[model samples]
Target: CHPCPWEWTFFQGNCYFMSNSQRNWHDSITACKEVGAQLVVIKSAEEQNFLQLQSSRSNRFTWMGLSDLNQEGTWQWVDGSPLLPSFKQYWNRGEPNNVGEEDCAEFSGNGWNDDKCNLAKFWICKKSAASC
Candidate 1:
């Protein structure tokens, strides 16, 4: 069957949702879990590039998978997954240039940078649900 435009993104083993609403870090995480998924856990550069193409860059804020709720220099995925080698997509200036203050991650086109998690921003979600 053809993929539904309003349904989760179709894939071999996963379904993803790029949420249209802006939300804070915790809120975004909750929202995804409610859908039986975590935030869009990027697993490949193709997915990263796809997300970048779908997202709009703002000087203010955006939503992503990384956040710093632990302490300075301690960053993690909202889902508690250890950021693996295949997952790090640092922005041009490199990681957390906004460190010590910024505690959220936002896609800076091809890479990412730190932003405020409390700030409402759009997000993406991924799940293993089957499409109807």
Candidate 2:
């Protein structure tokens, strides 16, 4: 039977890898691919809450899949899915301010915030259980 690997969490038919190590945004995604997963593309409050709760162990922020590299304000997941308008509730005020070439998204303790891609941080990766 296909199941998530050792230490990887499973939720909603997908496997989530909560990386304990730090890596810049670019390398984080590359690391995910190496493990047959991609940066998490959150789709619901349930899923978001799950991840948010799990991330409580770390003091530093964690990297997510959303980015605005192609355009200044347009955020899309690594899977190429656009960020939902309602999901903006998860972001802190004045976020994605585009300050200092900040194009990558990270999960802060209170909410999401856009930050520079070069900064190293923990990352979350997800892939379908069937793909295991």
Candidate 3:
């Protein structure tokens, strides 16, 4: 299980990456796109469960789909889906703070935080328009 980098798993309407290497948010997104995938998106409980199963219970960091790349204070997923009403795990306090340098999103075990988008952090990829 998760033997390969960028390995994909089918979950609901989208496919998810069970493994990934450290990369920035934009680069991570680009990395996924290079393989016809995108950053992981949380749309349902089943998908969330799949993510938890793939992640180590004590894992500290991984890429996520939330980002404020286009603008500060406005985070959005790679698919343009609003992160408005999704089930979330770990999230930094007053995060997406738009502190002016953070534009990337990552998950740690059961939380989310904004990063430089260029930091070398492990991540997950996703695809909903193609079969893996």
Please tell me which predicted candidate would have the highest TM-score against the true structure: 2
Model 1 Cα shift for residue 122 (angstroms): 0.4
Clashes of 1: 1
Quote model 3's TM-score.
0.73
- Report model 1's TM-score to 2 decimal places: 0.76
Order of candidate numbers by lDDT, starting with the best? 2, 1, 3
By summed lDDT, which 10 consecutive residues of candidate 2 come out lowest? 52-61
Better of 1 and 3 by TM-score: 1
lDDT of 3 by residue, 1-132 (tens): 332344456665566674545776677778888987777877777666668557756374788878876677677877888677454344656654646588777775545678777778877887764434
Off by over 4 Å in 3: 1-7, 58-60, 86-100, 129-132
| Candidate 2, 74-126: lDDT as tens digits | 99998888999989889888886878789999988778899999999999999
**Stretches of model 1 off by over 4 angstroms after superposition:** 1-6, 56-61, 129-132
> Each candidate: what lDDT?
0.70, 0.88, 0.68
TM-scores, all candidates, are 0.76, 0.92, 0.73
- Report model 2's TM-score to 2 decimal places: 0.92
Give Cα distance to truth, residue 32, candidate 1, Å. Answer: 1.0
